[PDB]
mmCIF file of N, CA and C and ligand atoms in Angstrom:
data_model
loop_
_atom_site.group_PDB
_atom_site.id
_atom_site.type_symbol
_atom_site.label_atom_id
_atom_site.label_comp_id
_atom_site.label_asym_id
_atom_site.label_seq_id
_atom_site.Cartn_x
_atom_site.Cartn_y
_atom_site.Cartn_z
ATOM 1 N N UNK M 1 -4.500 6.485 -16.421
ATOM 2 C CA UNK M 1 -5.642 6.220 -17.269
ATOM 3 C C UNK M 1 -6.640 5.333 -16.532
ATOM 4 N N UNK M 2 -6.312 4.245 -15.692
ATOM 5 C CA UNK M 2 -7.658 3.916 -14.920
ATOM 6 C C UNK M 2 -8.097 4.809 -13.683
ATOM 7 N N UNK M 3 -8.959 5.035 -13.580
ATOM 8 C CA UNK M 3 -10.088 6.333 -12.603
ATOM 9 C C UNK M 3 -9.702 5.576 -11.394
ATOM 10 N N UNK M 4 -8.832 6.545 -10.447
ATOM 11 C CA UNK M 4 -8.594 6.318 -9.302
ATOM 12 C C UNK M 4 -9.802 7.210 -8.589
ATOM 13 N N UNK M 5 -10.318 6.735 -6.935
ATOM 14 C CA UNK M 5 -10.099 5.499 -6.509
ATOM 15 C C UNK M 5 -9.941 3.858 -7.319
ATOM 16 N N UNK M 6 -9.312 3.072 -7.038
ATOM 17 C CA UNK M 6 -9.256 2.055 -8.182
ATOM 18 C C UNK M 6 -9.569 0.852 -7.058
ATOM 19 N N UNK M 7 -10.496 0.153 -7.366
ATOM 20 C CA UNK M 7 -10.456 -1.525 -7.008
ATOM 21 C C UNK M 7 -9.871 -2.592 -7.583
ATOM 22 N N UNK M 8 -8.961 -3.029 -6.681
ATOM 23 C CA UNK M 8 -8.300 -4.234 -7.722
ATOM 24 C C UNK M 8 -8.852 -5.568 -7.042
ATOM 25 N N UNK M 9 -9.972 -6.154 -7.465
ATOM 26 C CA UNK M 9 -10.190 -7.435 -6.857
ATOM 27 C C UNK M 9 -8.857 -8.298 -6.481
ATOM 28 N N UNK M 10 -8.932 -9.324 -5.783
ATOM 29 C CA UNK M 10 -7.486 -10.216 -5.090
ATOM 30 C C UNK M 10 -8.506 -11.519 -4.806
ATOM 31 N N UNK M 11 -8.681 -12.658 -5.791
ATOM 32 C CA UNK M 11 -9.430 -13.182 -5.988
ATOM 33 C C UNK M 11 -9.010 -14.598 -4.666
ATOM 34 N N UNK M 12 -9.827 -14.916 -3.551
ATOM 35 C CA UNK M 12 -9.276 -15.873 -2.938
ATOM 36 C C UNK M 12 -8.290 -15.324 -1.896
ATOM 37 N N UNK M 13 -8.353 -14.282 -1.953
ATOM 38 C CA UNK M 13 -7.464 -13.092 -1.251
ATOM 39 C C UNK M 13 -6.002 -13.285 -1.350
ATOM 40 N N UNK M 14 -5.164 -12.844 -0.917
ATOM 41 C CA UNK M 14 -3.696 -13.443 -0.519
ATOM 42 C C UNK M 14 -2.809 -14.536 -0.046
ATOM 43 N N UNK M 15 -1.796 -14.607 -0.576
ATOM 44 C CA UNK M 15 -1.284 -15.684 -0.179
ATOM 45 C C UNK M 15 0.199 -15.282 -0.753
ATOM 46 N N UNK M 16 1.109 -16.002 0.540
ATOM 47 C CA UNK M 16 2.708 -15.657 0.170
ATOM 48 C C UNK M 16 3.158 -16.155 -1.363
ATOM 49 N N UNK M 17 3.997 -15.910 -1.747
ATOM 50 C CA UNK M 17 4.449 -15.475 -3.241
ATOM 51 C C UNK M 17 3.630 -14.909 -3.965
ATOM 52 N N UNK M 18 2.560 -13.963 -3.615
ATOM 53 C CA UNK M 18 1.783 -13.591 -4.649
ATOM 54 C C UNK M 18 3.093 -11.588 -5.426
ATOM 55 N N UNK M 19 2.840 -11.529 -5.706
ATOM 56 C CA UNK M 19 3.687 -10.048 -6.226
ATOM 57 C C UNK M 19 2.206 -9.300 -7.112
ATOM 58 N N UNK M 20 2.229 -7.746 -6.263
ATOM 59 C CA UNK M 20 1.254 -6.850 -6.779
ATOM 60 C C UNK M 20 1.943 -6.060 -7.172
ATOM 61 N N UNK M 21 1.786 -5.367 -8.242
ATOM 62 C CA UNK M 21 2.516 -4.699 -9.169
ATOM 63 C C UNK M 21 1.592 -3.051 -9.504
ATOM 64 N N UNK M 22 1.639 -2.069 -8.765
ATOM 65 C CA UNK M 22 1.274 -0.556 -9.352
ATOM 66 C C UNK M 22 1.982 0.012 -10.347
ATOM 67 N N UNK M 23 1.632 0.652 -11.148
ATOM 68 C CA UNK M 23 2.083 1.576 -11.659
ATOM 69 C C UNK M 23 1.891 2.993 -12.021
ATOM 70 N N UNK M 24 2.154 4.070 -11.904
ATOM 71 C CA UNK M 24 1.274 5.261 -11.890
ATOM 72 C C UNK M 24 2.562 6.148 -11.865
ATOM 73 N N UNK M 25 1.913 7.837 -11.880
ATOM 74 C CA UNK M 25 3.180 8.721 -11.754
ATOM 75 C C UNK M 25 2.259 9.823 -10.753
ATOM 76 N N UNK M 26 2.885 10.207 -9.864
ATOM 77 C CA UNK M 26 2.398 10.972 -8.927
ATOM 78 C C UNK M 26 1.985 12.520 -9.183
ATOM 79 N N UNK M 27 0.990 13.328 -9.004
ATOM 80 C CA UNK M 27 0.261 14.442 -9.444
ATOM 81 C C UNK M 27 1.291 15.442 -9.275
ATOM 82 N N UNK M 28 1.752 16.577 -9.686
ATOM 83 C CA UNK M 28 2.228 17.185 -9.410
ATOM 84 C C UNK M 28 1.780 18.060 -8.384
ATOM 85 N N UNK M 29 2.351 18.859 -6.601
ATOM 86 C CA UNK M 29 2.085 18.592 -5.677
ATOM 87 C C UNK M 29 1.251 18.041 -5.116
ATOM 88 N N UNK M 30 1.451 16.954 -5.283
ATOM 89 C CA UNK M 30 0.577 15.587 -4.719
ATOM 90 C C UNK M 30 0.500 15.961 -2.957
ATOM 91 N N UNK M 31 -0.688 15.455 -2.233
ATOM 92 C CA UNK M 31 -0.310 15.679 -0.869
ATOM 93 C C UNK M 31 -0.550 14.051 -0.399
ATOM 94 N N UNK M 32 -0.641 13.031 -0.795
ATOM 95 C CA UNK M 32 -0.699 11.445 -0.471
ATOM 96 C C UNK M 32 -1.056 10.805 -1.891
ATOM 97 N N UNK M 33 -1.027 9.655 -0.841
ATOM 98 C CA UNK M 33 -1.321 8.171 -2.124
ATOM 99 C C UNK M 33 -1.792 7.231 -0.937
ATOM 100 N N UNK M 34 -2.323 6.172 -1.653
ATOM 101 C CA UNK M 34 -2.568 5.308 -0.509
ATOM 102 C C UNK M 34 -3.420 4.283 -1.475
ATOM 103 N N UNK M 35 -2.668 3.027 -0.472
ATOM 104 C CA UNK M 35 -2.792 1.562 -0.927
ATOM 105 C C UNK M 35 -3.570 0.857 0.252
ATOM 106 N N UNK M 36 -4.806 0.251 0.201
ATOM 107 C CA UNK M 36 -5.671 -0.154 0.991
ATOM 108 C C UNK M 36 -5.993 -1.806 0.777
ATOM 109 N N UNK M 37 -5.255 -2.934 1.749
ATOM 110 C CA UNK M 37 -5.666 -4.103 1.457
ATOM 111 C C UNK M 37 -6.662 -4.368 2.557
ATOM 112 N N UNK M 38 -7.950 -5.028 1.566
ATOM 113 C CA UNK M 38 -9.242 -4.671 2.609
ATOM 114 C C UNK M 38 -9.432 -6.352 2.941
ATOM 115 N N UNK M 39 -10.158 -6.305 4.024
ATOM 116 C CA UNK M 39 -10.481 -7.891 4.086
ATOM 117 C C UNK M 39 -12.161 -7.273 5.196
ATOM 118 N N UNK M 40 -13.068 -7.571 3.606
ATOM 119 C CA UNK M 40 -14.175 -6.774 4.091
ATOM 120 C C UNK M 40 -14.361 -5.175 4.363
ATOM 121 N N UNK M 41 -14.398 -4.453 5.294
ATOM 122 C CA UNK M 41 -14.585 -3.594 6.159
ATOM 123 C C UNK M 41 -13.179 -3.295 6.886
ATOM 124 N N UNK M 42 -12.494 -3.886 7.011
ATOM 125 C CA UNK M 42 -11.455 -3.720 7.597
ATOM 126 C C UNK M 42 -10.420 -4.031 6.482
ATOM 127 N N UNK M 43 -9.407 -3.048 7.196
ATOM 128 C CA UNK M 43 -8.454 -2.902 6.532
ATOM 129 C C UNK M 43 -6.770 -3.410 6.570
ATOM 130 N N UNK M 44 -6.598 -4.580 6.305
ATOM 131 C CA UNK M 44 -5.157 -4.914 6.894
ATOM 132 C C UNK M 44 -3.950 -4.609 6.479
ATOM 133 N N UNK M 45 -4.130 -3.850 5.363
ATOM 134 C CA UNK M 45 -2.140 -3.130 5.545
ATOM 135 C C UNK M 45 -2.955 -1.859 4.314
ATOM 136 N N UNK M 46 -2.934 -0.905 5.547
ATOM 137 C CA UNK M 46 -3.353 0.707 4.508
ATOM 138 C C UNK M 46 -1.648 1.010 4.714
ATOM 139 N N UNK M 47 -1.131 1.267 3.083
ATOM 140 C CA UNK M 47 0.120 2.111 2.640
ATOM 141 C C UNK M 47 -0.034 3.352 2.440
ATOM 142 N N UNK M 48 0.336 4.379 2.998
ATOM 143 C CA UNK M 48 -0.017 5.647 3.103
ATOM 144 C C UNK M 48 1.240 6.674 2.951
ATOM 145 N N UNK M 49 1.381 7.094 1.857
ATOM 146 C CA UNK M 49 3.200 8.429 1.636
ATOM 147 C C UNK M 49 2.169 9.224 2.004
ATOM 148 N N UNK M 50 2.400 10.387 2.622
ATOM 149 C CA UNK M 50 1.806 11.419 2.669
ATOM 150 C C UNK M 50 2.932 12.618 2.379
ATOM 151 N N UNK M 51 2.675 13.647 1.327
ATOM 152 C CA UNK M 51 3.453 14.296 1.109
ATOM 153 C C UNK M 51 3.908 15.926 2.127
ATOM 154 N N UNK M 52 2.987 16.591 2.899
ATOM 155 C CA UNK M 52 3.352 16.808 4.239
ATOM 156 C C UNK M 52 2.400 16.938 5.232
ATOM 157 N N UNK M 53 2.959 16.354 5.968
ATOM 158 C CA UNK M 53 2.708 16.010 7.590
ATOM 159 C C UNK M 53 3.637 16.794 8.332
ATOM 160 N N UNK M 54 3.181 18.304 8.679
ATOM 161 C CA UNK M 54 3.861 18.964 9.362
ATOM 162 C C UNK M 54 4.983 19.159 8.365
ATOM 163 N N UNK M 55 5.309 19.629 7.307
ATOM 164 C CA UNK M 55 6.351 19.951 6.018
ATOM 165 C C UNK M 55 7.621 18.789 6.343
ATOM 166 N N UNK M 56 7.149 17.337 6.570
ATOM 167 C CA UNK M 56 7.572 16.176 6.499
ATOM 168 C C UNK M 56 7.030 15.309 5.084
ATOM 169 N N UNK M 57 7.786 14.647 4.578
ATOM 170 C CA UNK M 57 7.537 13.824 3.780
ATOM 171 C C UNK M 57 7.683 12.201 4.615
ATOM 172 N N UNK M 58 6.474 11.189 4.558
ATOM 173 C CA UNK M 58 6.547 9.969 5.812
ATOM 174 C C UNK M 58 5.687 9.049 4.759
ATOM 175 N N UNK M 59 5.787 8.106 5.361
ATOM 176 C CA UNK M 59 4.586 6.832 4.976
ATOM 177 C C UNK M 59 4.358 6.239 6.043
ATOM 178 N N UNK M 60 3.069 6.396 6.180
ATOM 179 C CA UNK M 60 2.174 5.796 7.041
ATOM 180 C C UNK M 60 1.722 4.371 6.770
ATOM 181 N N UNK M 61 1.894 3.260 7.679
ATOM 182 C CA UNK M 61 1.310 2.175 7.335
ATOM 183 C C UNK M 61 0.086 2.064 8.766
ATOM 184 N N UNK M 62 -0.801 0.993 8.554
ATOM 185 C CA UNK M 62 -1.519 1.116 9.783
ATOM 186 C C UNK M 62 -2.595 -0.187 9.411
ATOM 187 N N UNK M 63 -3.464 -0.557 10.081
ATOM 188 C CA UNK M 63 -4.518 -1.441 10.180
ATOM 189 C C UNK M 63 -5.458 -1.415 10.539
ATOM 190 N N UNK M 64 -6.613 -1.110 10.040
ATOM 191 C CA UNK M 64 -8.222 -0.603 10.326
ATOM 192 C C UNK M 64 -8.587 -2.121 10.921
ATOM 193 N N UNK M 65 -9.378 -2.070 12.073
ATOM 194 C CA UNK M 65 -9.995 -3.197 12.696
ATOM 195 C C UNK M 65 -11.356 -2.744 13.259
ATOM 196 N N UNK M 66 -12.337 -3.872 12.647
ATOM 197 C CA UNK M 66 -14.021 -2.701 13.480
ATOM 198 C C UNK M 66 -13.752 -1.398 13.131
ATOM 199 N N UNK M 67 -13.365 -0.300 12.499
ATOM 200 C CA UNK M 67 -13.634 0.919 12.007
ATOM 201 C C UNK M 67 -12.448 1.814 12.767
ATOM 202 N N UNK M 68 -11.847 0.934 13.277
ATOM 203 C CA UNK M 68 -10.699 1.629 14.153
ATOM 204 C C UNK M 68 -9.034 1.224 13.973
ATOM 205 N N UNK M 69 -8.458 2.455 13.618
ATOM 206 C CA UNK M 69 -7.107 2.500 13.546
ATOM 207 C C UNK M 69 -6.263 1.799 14.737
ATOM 208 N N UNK M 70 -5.111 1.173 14.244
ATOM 209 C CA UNK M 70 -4.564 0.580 15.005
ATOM 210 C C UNK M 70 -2.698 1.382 15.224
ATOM 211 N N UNK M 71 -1.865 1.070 15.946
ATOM 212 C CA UNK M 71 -0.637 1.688 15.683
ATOM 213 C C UNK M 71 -0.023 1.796 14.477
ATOM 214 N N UNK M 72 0.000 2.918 14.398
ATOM 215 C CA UNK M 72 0.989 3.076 12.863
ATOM 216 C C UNK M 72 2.416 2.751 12.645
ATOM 217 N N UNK M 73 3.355 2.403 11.879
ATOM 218 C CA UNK M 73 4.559 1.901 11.501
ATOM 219 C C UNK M 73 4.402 3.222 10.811
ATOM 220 N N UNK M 74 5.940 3.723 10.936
ATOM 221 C CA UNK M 74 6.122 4.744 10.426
ATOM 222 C C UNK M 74 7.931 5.253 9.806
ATOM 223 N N UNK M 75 8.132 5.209 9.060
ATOM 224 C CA UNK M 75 9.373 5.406 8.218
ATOM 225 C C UNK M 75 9.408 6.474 7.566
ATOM 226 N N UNK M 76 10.911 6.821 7.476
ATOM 227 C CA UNK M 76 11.315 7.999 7.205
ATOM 228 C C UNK M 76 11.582 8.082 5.578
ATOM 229 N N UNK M 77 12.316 7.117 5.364
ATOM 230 C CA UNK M 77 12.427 6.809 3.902
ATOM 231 C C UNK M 77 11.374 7.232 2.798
ATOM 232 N N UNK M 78 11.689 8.170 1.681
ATOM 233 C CA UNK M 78 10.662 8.145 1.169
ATOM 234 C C UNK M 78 10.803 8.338 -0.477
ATOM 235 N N UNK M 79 10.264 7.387 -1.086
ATOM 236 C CA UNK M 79 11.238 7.297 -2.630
ATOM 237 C C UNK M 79 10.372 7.842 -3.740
ATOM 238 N N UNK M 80 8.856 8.656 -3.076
ATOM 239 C CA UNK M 80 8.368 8.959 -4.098
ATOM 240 C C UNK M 80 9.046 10.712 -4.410
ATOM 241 N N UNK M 81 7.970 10.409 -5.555
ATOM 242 C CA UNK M 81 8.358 12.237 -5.959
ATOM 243 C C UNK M 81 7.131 13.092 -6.664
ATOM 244 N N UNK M 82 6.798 14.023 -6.353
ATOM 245 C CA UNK M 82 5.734 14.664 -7.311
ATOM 246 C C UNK M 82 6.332 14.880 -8.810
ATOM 247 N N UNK M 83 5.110 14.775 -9.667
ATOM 248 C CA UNK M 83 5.294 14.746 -11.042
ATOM 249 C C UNK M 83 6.058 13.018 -11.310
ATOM 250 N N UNK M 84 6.259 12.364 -11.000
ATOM 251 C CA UNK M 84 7.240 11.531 -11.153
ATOM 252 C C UNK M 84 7.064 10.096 -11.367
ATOM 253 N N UNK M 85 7.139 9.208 -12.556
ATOM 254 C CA UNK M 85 6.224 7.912 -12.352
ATOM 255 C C UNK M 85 7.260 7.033 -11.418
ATOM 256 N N UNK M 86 5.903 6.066 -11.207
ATOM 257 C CA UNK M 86 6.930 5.104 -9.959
ATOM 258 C C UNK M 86 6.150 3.440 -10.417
ATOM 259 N N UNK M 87 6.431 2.476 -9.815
ATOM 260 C CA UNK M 87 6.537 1.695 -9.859
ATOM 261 C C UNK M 87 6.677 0.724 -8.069
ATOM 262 N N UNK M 88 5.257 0.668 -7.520
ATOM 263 C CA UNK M 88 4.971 0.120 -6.181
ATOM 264 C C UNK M 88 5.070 -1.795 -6.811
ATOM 265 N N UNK M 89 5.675 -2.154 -5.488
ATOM 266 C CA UNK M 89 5.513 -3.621 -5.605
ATOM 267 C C UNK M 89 5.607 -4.299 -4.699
ATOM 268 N N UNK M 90 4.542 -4.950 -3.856
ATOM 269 C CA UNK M 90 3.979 -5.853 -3.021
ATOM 270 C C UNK M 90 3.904 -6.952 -2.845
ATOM 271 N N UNK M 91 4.715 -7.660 -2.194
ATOM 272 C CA UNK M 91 5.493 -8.963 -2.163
ATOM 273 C C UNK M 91 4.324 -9.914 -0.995
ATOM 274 N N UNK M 92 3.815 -10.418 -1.141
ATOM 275 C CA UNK M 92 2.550 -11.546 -0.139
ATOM 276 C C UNK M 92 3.958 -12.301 0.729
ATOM 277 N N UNK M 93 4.626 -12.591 1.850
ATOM 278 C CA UNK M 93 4.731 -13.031 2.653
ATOM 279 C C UNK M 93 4.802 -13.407 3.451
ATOM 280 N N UNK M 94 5.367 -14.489 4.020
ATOM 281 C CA UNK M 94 4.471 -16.073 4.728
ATOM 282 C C UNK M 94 4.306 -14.947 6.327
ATOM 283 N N UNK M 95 5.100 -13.838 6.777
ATOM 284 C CA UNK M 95 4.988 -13.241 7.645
ATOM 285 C C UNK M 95 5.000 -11.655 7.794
ATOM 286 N N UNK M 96 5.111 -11.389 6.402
ATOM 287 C CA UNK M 96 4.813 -10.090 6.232
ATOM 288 C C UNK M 96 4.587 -9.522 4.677
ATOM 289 N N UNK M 97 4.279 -8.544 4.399
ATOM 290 C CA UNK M 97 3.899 -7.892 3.493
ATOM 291 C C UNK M 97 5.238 -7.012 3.283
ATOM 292 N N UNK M 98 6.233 -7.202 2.108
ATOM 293 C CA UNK M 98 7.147 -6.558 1.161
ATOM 294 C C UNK M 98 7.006 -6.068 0.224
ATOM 295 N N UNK M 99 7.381 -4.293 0.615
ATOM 296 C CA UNK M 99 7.249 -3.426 -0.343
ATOM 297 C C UNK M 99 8.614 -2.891 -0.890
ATOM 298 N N UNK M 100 8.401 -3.184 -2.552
ATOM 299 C CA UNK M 100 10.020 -2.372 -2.989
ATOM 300 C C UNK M 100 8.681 -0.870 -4.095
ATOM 301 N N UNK M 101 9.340 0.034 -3.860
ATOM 302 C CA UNK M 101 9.675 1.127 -4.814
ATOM 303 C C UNK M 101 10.361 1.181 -5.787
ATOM 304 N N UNK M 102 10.086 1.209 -7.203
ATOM 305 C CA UNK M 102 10.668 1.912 -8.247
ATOM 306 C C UNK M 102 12.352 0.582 -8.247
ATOM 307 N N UNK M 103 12.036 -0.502 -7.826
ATOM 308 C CA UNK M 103 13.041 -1.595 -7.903
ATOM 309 C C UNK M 103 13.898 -1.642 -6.501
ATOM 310 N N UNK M 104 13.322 -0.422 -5.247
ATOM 311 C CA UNK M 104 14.577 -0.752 -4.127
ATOM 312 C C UNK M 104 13.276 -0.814 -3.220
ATOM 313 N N UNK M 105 14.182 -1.901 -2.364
ATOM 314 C CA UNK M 105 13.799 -2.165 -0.952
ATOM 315 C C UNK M 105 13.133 -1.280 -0.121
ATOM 316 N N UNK M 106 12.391 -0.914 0.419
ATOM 317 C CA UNK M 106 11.009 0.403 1.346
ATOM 318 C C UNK M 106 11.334 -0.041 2.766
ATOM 319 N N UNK M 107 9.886 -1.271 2.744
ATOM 320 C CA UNK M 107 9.680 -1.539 3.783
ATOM 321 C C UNK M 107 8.900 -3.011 4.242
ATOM 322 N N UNK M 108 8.694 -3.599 5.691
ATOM 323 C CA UNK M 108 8.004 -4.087 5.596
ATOM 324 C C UNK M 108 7.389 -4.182 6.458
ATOM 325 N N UNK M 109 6.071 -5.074 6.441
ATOM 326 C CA UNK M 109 4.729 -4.649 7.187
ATOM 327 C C UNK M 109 4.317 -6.050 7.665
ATOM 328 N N UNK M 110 4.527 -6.468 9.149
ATOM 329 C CA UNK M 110 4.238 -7.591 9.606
ATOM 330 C C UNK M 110 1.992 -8.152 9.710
ATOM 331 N N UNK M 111 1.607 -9.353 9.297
ATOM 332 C CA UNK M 111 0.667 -9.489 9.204
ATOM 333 C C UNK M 111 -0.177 -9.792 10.676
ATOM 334 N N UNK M 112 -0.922 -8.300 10.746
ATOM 335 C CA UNK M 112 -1.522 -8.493 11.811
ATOM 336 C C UNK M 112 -3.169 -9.231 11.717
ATOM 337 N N UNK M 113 -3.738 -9.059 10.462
ATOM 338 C CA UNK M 113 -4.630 -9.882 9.952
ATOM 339 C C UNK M 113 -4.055 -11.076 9.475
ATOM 340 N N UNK M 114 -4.646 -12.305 9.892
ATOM 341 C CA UNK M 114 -3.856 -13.526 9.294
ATOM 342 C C UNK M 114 -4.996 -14.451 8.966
ATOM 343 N N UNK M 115 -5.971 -13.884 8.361
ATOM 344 C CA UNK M 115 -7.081 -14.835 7.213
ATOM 345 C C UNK M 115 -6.769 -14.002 5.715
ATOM 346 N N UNK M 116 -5.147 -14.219 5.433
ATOM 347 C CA UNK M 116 -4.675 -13.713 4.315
ATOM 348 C C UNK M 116 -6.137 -14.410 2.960
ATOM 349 N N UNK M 117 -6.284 -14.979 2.876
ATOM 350 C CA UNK M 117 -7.325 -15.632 2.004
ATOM 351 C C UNK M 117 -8.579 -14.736 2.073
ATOM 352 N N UNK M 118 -8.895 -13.617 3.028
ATOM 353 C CA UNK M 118 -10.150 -13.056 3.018
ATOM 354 C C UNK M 118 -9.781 -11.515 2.763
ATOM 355 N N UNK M 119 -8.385 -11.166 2.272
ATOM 356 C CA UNK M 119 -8.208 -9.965 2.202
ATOM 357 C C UNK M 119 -8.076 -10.192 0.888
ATOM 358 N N UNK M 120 -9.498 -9.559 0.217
ATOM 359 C CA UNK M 120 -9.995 -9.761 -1.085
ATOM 360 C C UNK M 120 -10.016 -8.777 -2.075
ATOM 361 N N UNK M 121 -9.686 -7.156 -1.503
ATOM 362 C CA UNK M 121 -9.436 -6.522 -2.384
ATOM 363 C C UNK M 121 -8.320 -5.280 -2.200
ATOM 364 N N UNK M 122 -8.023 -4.574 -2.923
ATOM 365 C CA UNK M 122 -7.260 -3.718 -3.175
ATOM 366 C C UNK M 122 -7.440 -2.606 -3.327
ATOM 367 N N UNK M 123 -7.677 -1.490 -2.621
ATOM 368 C CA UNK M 123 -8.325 0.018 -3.186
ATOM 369 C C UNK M 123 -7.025 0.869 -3.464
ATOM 370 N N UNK M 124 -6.695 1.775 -4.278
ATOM 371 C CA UNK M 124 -5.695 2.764 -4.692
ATOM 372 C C UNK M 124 -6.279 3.716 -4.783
ATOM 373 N N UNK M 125 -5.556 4.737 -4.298
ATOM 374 C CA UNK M 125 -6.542 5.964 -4.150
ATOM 375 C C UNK M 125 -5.454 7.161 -4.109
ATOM 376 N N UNK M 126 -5.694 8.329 -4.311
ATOM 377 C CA UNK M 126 -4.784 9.707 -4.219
ATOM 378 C C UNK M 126 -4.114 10.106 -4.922
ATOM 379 N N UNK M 127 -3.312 10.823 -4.685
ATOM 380 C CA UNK M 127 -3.072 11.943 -6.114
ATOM 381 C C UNK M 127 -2.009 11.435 -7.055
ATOM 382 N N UNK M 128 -2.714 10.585 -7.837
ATOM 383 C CA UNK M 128 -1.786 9.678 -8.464
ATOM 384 C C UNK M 128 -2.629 9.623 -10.085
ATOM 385 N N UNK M 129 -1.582 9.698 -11.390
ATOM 386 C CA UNK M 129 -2.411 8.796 -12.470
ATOM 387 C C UNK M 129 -2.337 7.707 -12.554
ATOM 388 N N UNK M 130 -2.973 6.371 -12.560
ATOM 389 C CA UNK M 130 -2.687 5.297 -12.548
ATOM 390 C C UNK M 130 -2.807 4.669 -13.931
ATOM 391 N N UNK M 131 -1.651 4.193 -13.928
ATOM 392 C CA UNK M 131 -1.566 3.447 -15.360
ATOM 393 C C UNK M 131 -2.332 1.527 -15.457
ATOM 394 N N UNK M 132 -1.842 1.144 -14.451
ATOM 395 C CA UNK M 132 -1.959 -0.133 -14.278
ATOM 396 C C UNK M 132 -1.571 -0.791 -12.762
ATOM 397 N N UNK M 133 -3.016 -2.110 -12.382
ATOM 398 C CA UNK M 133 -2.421 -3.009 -11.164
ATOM 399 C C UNK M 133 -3.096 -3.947 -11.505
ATOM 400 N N UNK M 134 -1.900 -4.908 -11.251
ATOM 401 C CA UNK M 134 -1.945 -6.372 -11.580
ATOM 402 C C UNK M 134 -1.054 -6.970 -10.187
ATOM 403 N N UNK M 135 -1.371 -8.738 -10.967
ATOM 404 C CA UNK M 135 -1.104 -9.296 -9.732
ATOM 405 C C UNK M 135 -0.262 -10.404 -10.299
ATOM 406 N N UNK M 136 0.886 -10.978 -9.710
ATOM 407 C CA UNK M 136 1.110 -12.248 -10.543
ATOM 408 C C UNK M 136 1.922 -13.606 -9.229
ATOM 409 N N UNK M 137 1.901 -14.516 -9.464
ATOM 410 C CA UNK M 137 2.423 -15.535 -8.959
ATOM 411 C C UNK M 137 3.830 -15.709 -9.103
ATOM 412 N N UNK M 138 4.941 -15.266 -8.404
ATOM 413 C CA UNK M 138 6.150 -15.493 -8.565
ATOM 414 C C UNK M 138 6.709 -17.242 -7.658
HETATM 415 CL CL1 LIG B 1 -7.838 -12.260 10.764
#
């Protein structure tokens, strides 16, 4: 129900213990999703499932710098599902960014941007309905 692409402001940007909370259920044959923490123009942890890549199911993580992609992290694991609601959750820490799925452990994503305070917003985007994203202080 909120109109993806979605902006989720991140007021003061990030900071460890923060917990981001998605919720949505994935399109039925969905071909991606993707979670974009922006700091400005650049992008410091794009979350990317892509549903096939070469009739692979993967998630792409990566880091836009000046308009340019940086090495991708790339895992095999993959807990989404078409048609299927899920439950993303984004853990702010002191050295990396923790993602659980649907309550289990994913992955994690070391901070290669480290003016966590200027990565101010949140874009959600792809073949997803989105129900709700919030943010809370654990
Ligand atoms: Cl930085």
């Amino acid at each position: 129900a909120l109109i993806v692409p979605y902006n989720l402001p991140l007021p003061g940007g990030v900071v460890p213990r923060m917990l981001i909370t998605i919720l949505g259920t994935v399109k039925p044959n969905a071909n991606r999703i993707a979670l974009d923490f922006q700091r400005g123009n650049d992008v410091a942890f794009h979350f990317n499932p892509r549903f096939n890549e070469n009739n692979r199911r993967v998630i792409v993580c990566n880091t836009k710098l000046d308009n340019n992609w940086g090495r991708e992290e790339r895992q095999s694991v993959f807990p989404f599902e078409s048609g299927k609601p899920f439950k993303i959750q984004v853990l702010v820490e002191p050295d990396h960014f923790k993602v659980a799925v649907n309550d289990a452990h994913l992955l994690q994503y070391n901070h290669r941007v480290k003016k966590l305070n200027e990565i101010s917003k949140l874009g959600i985007s792809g073949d997803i309905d989105l129900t709700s994203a919030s943010y809370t202080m654990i």
